[PDB]
Amino acid sequence: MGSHSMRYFFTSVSRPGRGEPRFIAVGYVDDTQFVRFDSDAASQRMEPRAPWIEQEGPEYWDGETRKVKAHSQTHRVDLGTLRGYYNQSEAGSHTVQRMYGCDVGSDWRFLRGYHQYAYDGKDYIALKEDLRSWTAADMAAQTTKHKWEAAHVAEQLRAYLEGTCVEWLRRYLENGKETLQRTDAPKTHMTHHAVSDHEATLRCWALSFYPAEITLTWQRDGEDQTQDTELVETRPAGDGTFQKWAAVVVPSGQEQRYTCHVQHEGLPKPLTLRWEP
C-alpha cells in the first residue's frame, strides 16, 4: 500500500511515592501495533501484538527486550535529571515521552526519519529533518543539545534511521504482507434523522477501513459545505480497522442536493454518496 512507516513510542511516568517509573513502549508499522513492553506486566519481555512478528526467533526477542529495558533505565535517569533542571519537587509525578521512526516511499526507499522527545507533554528536543542537527525548545534542552552534539548522537541515529530502520520495515512489510500491504476501503452508507418537521440530519458513514487516513466532505449543489456540519475524530473499531462519520443538517425535502465525498488510499476514485433513498 504505497508509502509506509515504522514508529516506536515510549512513555515513562515517575512514581514518587514508591518504586520505578511506569514504562510503556509500543511499536507500529503503519497503523498496526506489532510489539509492546509494559514495566508492570509479568513477562518483563518485549511481546508480540501481531501474528507476523511471532515468527521472529529468540535472538530477536532477547535483543529487543534488552534494548527496551535499557531505554526504560535511560528514561528513569532522565526523570531525575529533568526534575532538577526544572526545579520541581520530589513529590510530583512527571512524564517523559519519546517517538522515533522512519518512512519509506512507495518504492520502499528511505523518505524521512524522526526522533523527538517531550517532558510533561511539551516539546523538549527533536532531531531536524536533515538528521544532522537538533531543535531545543528551552535552555534545559539546549544543555542536552550540546551534550548530544559532543557525543555524535545525531550521526548514530541517522545511520539507524536510513539503514536498519528501513531494512527491518521492509522485512516486516513482506512478512506481514497479507495484512500490511492490504488496503481496506471504507464500507460506506448514509443515514437520515429527522430533527423537526422542517430539518433533518444526513450522516455519512465510513466503516471497517485501513489505513486510518481518510477524508469525508459534504457538498451542496457540487460545492464544499462546512457550515451546519459535524465530523467526529477517526476512531479504532478494535479489530484493526477504523471508523468515521460526517453529518450535515438540511432543510427536509432538499436532501438530494447534498453529497458526501469519501477519499481513501483503498479507493481508486473517491466515492460520492447521495440520499436518494
Partner: peptide, 10 residues
C-alpha cells in the same frame, strides 16, 4: 527493530 544499543541520557 529498535535503535540500539541505547539512547543517551538528556
Amino acid at each position: 527493530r529498535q535503535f540500539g544499543p541505547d539512547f543517551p541520557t538528556i
